[PDB]
Amino acid sequence: PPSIGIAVILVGTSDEVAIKDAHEKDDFHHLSVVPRVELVAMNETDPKSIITRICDLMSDRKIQGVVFADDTDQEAIAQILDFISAQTLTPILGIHGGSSMIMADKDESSMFFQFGPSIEQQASVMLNIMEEYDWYIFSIVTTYFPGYQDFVNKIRSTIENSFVGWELEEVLLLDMSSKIQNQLKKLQSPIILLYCTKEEATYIFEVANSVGLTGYGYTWIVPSLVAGDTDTVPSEFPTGLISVSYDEWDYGLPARVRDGIAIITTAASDMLSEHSFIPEPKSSCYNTHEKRIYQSNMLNRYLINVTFEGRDLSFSEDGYQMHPKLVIILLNKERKWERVGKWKDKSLQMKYYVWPRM
Ligand SMILES: *[C@H]1O[C@H](CO)[C@@H](O)[C@H](O)[C@H]1NC(C)=O
Ligand SMILES: *[C@H]1O[C@H](CO)[C@@H](O)[C@H](O)[C@H]1NC(C)=O
Ligand SMILES: [Cl-]
Ligand SMILES: [Cl-]
Ligand SMILES: [Cl-]
Numbered sequence: 001p002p003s004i005g006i007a008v009i010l011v012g013t014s015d016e017v018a019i020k021d022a023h024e025k026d027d028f029h030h031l032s033v034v035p036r037v038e039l040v041a042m043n044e045t046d047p048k049s050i051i052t053r054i055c056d057l058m059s060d061r062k063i064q065g066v067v068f069a070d071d072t073d074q075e076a077i078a079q080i081l082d083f084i085s086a087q088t089l090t091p092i093l094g095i096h097g098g099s100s101m102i103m104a105d106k107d108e109s110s111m112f113f114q115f116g117p118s119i120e121q122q123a124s125v126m127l128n129i130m131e132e133y134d135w136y137i138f139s140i141v142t143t144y145f146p147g148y149q150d151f152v153n154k155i156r157s158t159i160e161n162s163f164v165g166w167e168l169e170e171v172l173l174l175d176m177s178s179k180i181q182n183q184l185k186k187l188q189s190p191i192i193l194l195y196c197t198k199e200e201a202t203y204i205f206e207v208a209n210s211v212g213l214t215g216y217g218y219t220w221i222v223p224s225l226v227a228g229d230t231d232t233v234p235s236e237f238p239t240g241l242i243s244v245s246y247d248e249w250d251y252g253l254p255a256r257v258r259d260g261i262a263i264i265t266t267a268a269s270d271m272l273s274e275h276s277f278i279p280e281p282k283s284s285c286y287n288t289h290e291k292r293i294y295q296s297n298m299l300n301r302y303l304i305n306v307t308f309e310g311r312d313l314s315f316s317e318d319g320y321q322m323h324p325k326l327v328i329i330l331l332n333k334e335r336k337w338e339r340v341g342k343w344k345d346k347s348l349q350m351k352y353y354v355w356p357r358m
């Protein structure tokens with residue numbers, strides 16, 4: 001009877017997820033370790049309540065992994081999660097929501113992994129797109145949000161060694177606090193890559209709009225986290241906003257949760273398989289006598305590499321999904337987001353030959 005407690009935390013999600021009450025210890029998809037899954041649906045959605053709720057839970061019950069989803073647009077959630085994964089040397093998966101928005105810096109000791117694309121993959125795709133439509137002259141505009149440095153580099157890198165005639169005209173760096181205007185006015189290019197948070201973005205646009213740089217002639221392309229919840233669209237978001245997004249259509253929540261439990265339950269089974277051990281439950285986020293810093297690294301070798309049934313879920317070093325299915329989307333005229341492209345693996349399939357006008 002090899003068990004492993006898993007917490008499924010669902011902050012703000014509509015309760016459409018139903019987990020087997022674990023009476024009959026029937027095994028999960030024929031894996032050696034039975035996951036004892038504890039469901040939890042927090043109502044309050046502020047980070048404070050989450051840190052409290054997750055932590056309390058970890059001392060009360062015997063948890064050796066956390067699958068965590070939220071329907072909020074708070075990248076904040078990611079900090080609290082990386083922190084906990086670190087303090088407790090426990091794997092925590094950022095399955096969806098703010099909890100999975102690119103966290104650039106990340107405690108290299110933590111086991112916080114996020115679903116969806118890395119800052120790099122996303123950059124590599126935004127260029128992948130600009131080619132399909134021979135959009136070669138462009139400016140970058142980032143804020144100070146962690147990642148900006150890593151993002152700009154990925155662009156500059158792929159540019160340098162490319163036969164294609166890329167012209168990176170400007171790169172801005174916005175000290176938010178409206179001195180932005182004097183900066184954003186200096187923009188010439190037609191294509192603009194804007195790297196920042198959703199909330200930062202809405203200010204940045206409100207400004208550009210009353211400077212014209214947002215309209216016809218200018219198309220803005222933007223990372224997955226600025227789209228955020230596609231159901232919430234700022235007034236200031238320009239129609240004709242291109243964005244990369246994780247795929248919330250063919251990939252429902254319950255499928256991720258399944259995948260979450262799978263990732264962990266596999267790693268655990270493959271460790272019990274190679275060493276008669278599964279790391280005891282750590283029971284404090286704070287009071288840390290759990291200097292068990294070694295059995296961690298071992299687990300971490302198995303989590304990082306799961307492939308389950310059809311899907312491949314192996315993770316990158318910086319804790320992003322290595323092979324995510326992406327969707328390019330477009331802020332239309334009626335102000336919804338349309339699907340207008342897919343990305344499989346280095347394979348960018350678009351829907352239109354003539355790029356639409358909104
Ligand atoms: C959630 O439900 C409880 C139960 O009565 C309520 O008192 C609380 O304020 C609610 N919070 C939100 C954001 O709806
Ligand atoms: C993950 O990496 C290891 C290390 O050699 C490899 O042997 C393993 O089979 C990989 N995952 C899969 C599904 O092959
Ligand atoms: Cl929110
Ligand atoms: Cl993201
Ligand atoms: Cl950075």
Ligand SMILES: [Cl-]
Pocket residue numbers: 258
């Ligand atoms: Cl299942």
Ligand SMILES: [Cl-]
Pocket residue numbers: 339340341342350351
């Ligand atoms: Cl499509």
Ligand code: NA
Pocket residue numbers: 100101102114115116117224246
């Ligand atoms: Na993500």
Ligand SMILES: [Zn+2]
Pocket residue numbers: 029309
């Ligand atoms: Zn199955």
Ligand SMILES: [Zn+2]
Pocket residue numbers: 131132133
């Ligand atoms: Zn092409």
Ligand SMILES: [Zn+2]
Pocket residue numbers: 096248252253
């Ligand atoms: Zn979703």
Ligand SMILES: [Zn+2]
Pocket residue numbers: 274275
């Ligand atoms: Zn051993």
Ligand SMILES: [Zn+2]
Pocket residue numbers: 322323344345346
């Ligand atoms: Zn791939």
